[PDB]
Point group: D2
Chain length 120, copies 4
């Protein structure tokens, strides 16, 4: 149920393939751009989740460098997939920027994204 296209509340889109081995691969597009806003993503998911109605744990990373831009940053999303008629991926994320040592204390933003199969 994970493979395909997902949309969050900020207008971002990612397109992921969930491999039988637990790999996540695909692309993440930040809301504003087209090709210039598309970045590689890779991650992992639980390919044998519980059958007790629990979600499926997963995570992925995007480094914000592509052939157009480099924001010297990387975001990781950690969350779970919840299936059904209104499938969701509920996540929390950490965005770390490369900083000097003096600024390391303010290197990392935290937030939360909810992804759905249809645009908000």
């Amino acid at each position: 149920g994970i493979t395909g296209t997902w949309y969050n509340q900020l207008g971002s889109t990612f397109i992921v393939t969930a491999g039988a081995d637990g790999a996540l691969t695909g692309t993440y597009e930040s809301a504003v751009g087209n090709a210039e806003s598309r970045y590689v993503l890779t991650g992992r998911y639980d390919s044998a989740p519980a059958t007790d109605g629990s979600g499926t744990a997963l995570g992925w990373t995007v480094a914000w460098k592509n052939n157009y831009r480099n924001d010297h940053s990387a975001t990781t999303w950690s969350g779970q997939y919840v299936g059904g008629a209104e499938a969701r991926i509920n996540t929390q994320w950490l965005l770390t920027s490369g900083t000097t040592e003096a600024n390391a204390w303010k290197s990392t933003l935290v937030g939360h994204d909810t992804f759905t199969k249809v645009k908000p």
Copy 2:
């Protein structure tokens, strides 16, 4: 400077290859076990970091399933590599477990790991 073996304060070891394209691949071993405690990891890093003395942003994911165990969970680490004589990868992480909807509010642990090239 990222490729190789790193150790954190909990006794965990990971071994990563940083690809020229920005890929991170390797294995993460939780402290206690041998093969039963080794898990696939994948991630991304900034393959063209700033040259102003800033760290190199990166992130990776481990899903805690292998051929021996499955904890129905996944951890993402977000941080930066800092080079030099005492190289470090400074991270913050999110560990999400698959949960029922009723328990989703307590699905995600947060913490921090510092990795060095030598065992603590």
Copy 3:
């Protein structure tokens, strides 16, 4: 301003707070008497006038006269005024643990509070 009163999150919890002129937040958090806990925090009592939210934070230690969970939650966020006022937060819930278990001491999450249930 706009913060004093009763707030409700998505989980069905009730946050009753007084925002003092001095930047203090005081009140109670109900997550029945058994479920009511003291809260105290701080807010920016002179926020920007450029349309930005009002930064704030508070803590609940999960001990009252009835129960003790040996844990505490802190919420960090901002108040956003207007017709559909909100307090948008992220929180950290730390449990007392042994040193061996300290790596898994802290949960993270997010709550949105509104003025209506």
Copy 4:
């Protein structure tokens, strides 16, 4: 118990706190007078007696008589007693933002506090 007093973190900040019998934390955070801010929080005033830490949290809004950063930090953690006493924390720093910038409103980090600099 063991919490009242002065604490120092790895960044050179100074945390001066009184832990009240009722579970209250009050004091000041210096991150000079210009750099001193009010703090208030809560702690578990009847912690477990099994070797677990004592859960606590506090907030500083970064406004004082000299400066206002339109932001607030909450620390969530636990006190660990003994010869080498510590308060181990993780924190959230939320800045007031526009709604457009709210996705990047909140920094996360960690501080360790000790009784000696």
